[model samples]
Target: DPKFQRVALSDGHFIPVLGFGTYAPEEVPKSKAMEATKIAIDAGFRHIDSAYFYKNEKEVGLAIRSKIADGTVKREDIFYTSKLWCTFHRPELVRPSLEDSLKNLQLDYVDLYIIHFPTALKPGVEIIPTDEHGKAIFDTVDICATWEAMEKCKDAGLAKSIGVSNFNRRQLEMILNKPGLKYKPVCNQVECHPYLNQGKLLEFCKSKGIVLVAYSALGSHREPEWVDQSAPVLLEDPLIGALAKKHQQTPALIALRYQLQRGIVVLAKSFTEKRIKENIQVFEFQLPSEDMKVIDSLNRNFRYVTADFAIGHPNYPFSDEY
Candidate 1:
């Protein structure tokens, strides 16, 4: 009876497997958020991923409210996710950070609220306290303490599910094994695509009853400026192009469907009306087992969001092999 497929979270809530990513580049006009969000809803995306850093929560919320007003969708029909920026990583500042997002969103609660990254920055400073060369100043704080604050958000009904983003296995274990752990994180959102398939991390999370959510699924479509400009494009790969031809679908569809078949909750970001409509076409077909194997062979362990600037931080998550 649902419009899109859903995966169950540990907190007894279900997340729509196909989500509309709401992180547009900072240079993009603020109104673009509302325009694209409305298009995504019309195209049947039930899950929306946003963050405080994105700076478009108000427009995203406006789009949702507009749809619900005209009866296109209901508030409960949407699964909204927001994040706590690094600057607000302190245990005392966690709830206020989420409150800021909810105020911008005009919502009583967010379905999921996750730590934007494992590292902490100066709480009194701006979002990114970068020096002359743009290297951010990192602050030291216990992640478990921050998780405790996130648990409070859940306990207070501000967030139905609490999770983490960009965290590696050891970091996840830190929160999972906290002495007075109130709730285990239900999902780990990371950069995942054909190139950075994240097979090991996915298996590990699955073993621990955590869902691995994927971003940058179609190879950094409209990538942020922080990404390497010289990186190869996933949709332009010869193998995927050939497969797209064989399947009579676009290479983007091949990439997206591959993730869906692997049980990953994929995020699709597109301001183009046609692509937004096309992305929802993923569920119309299934990749054969052999074809799925071919896609799996494309894994190169490539990461688009390299936290090189934060490498100096002692708790950098990307140093691990995972």
Candidate 2:
């Protein structure tokens, strides 16, 4: 644990550089999330990331509570992050949505609450409510309204901090430029890895005092009928493999460490206990400057979770360069 550095956020709260991601696909047994989360906490991951869209918050909450009950960790010792889904972007729905997440996590409060995405959808029991024709139903609420509500959650002590995910530079500017914003988003969680490094966006956030929280940093991420099959494997890349051998580490460690060296908060996702434990070992070694240079060149600007159908929306944030 001494090897893992905790970074102080702009708001003065600190988070561990390495975090555990608890997203489970529908086909996988729900029990896997609970088991994996417990294993990860026992393995020394202090940070946990989840979303309402993931549909596994209850299990994650159960695991964390169990860990605390068994004396493995204290509630204050953990950093739990949850997201507000698109369907809840309407101003009035924000607090209720966080209330639902708080219920699912069974926690009095969460370390971080983030706007899952800039896009808004029709409020529904279903995450992505669709029309009879199966096209996604888009809600036209201005994103600033959602931010206003997020600020209220902070004031109510429901969340320690508020942030955003999948936001472009322009979208962030909108929040930053709000006439009378209460709190600035502390971080921006996005699909980042060697392939989709999002260098420009990372630089932008650094300049703005916002941390870039990276998901899918080791790549090989997939979702139901959403992820493109043609995407290349990241840990399998020859450069990463060569570095793994040089440092006597797994390709996954190489990828995770690369992001950490760049000062990004990174999540390591795995259901297998062995991989979960192994991921924490990223703290064992530091990447050399030359090696960092090589890994930085691996950026190909690729994204796994591209919402192509939604690009047609007026508020589509992906159209911009960063």
Candidate 3:
């Protein structure tokens, strides 16, 4: 388990630096989640990341249980993360929402539970409730209230640790500066890679003692609904290509390694067994300072997962420069 290096959270919990992401677009078979998650565990991944929005928790849970049944690892050995979707932002809805996921997971508690996004959608059965005209129905809820409910989730032992995703500097500060804050966020998961290195946010989180967890660490596999189809792919970048050749690694590994070098916990998503096995090799090599700087220079603030659907919502986070 030496390869599963862990970092301490502000709440005194530890998370594996490398996590396997279980998110895939709707078109991919749901079974892929179970299959890929099982493969990832067998390939030496100790952390697994999934979200309620992904709509495949049952399969992901099944994979975790199957591995445990076969004695691959105990439940405590695997740090599993689940998220709170926007529709459940209401304070009263928080615990029940977590319970819903728990029921789906058939697990008593999750290692880490995070707010999926800063934006709040109307609470309802639909994941993205829309109007008759097809416009997204947005809800106005105090994010502080949501955080308070999240704190309650931690207090109730439903989640071992709590944090957020897609929150910007200002939004994070809101929780940090709350009048009666119980716990500061443990991490802020976001779309981060060479194109969007998140240097300023990383520095800010470091100063606050909050870990920064990276999603889409190897650029992102585009989903037409959220990502711009024409955006440049990180793995195809010429500089990354040159580094891959020089380091004797794939461009994906180089990108993942860069995040680890920066002290950010990163998640790698792939259904292919070979890629799943290969990504764990990120810990096998170290990037020199010169190479790290060259990769740093690749940042251009390009975001692949734009929350365009909630652009004008009161809590829309992407408008900020972070």
Candidate 4:
């Protein structure tokens, strides 16, 4: 049986605590993604986390629908979350992006829709939009305007809930304090793992009744090519290994359990059938309070994936902060 925990969002919808991550094996064929999703569903995973940037939602959607069609899983049984790309941050482009995602996924609506990132490419530009001299042209767009449009997605029934991704404390505060803002963002998706614990951000979201969704929960071992190699390895930590031994579980399972116990939604990704099945064992055991404290002590304010491109962009949300 799958362990189902309800996370109440500010918008009054409850998101599941554990979600299957669809970030498949790099350079792998699309069929592998669908196959992995099928294995995850058969293993009792109901919540799925995907993104436009992953470029595999088409295959992911096909697998989920295949399960639904064959009666292996019901559409309502799954909680789906997809992100709007950085290039679509303009107020007018927001709806089109949502609809495009919906169409690609073959679903009428997503359970949760998130603004992928706070930064925006210049108007009429793509993510790698280049200027006349072929320089990287970045532009700042109004976050409030983009957020307002995201709110409209919920109202239009295109998305059951709406939120932001990669937003920090100050960025979130600005959205909440925006004048005439009608809808509140329900969650903040960030890179969280034993290495990058994001303590203060998690505490703030908890206090504000906003759900915290963690990406790269397993230390992002499958991180992009540009990520520095010198960064600490989260899964190999002796502390986590010891806790896993105590709990008769694996280090990866302990990592997932640590976040769920603290009321954060964790997205664990893998293309291997064995690992996919093993990832969901998180709900099978509970972490002891003392062990939980030990894991908490591992937080070192380490951020493995920082949105540095947004630092100098005009709409850079956290430019003034350290």
Write down the lDDT of every candidate, Cα atoms only.
0.90, 0.89, 0.93, 0.84
TM-scores for all candidates: the values are 0.97, 0.97, 0.98, 0.93
- lDDT (tens digit, per residue) of candidate 2 on 1-322: 5544688787888888899998867788778999999999999998999998888889999999999999999998899999998889899999998898899889999999999888898887777777797888888999998999999999999999899999999999999999999899999999888888888999999999999999988784566477776778787899999999999999999999999989999998899989998999988888899998898888888887787656557777788988
> Residue 310 of candidate 3: its Cα lDDT?
92
Evaluation by lDDT, superior candidate among 1 and 2: 1
Writing each residue's lDDT as its tens digit, candidate 3 over 1-322 gives 5577899998999999999999888889889999999999999998999999998889999999999999999999999999999999999999999999999999999999999999999998898899897778999999999999999999999999999999999999999999999999999999899999999999999999999999999877777777777888888999999999999999999999999989999999999999999999988888899999999989888988887779779888988898
| Number of the top lDDT candidate | 3
Q: lDDT order of candidates, best first?
A: 3, 1, 2, 4
Q: Candidate 4's error at 35, in angstroms? A: 1.5
Q: Which regions of candidate 3 fall more than 4 Å away from where they truly are?
A: none
In model 3, the clashing pairs are: none
Scored against the true structure, residue 161 in model 4 reaches a CA lDDT of: 91
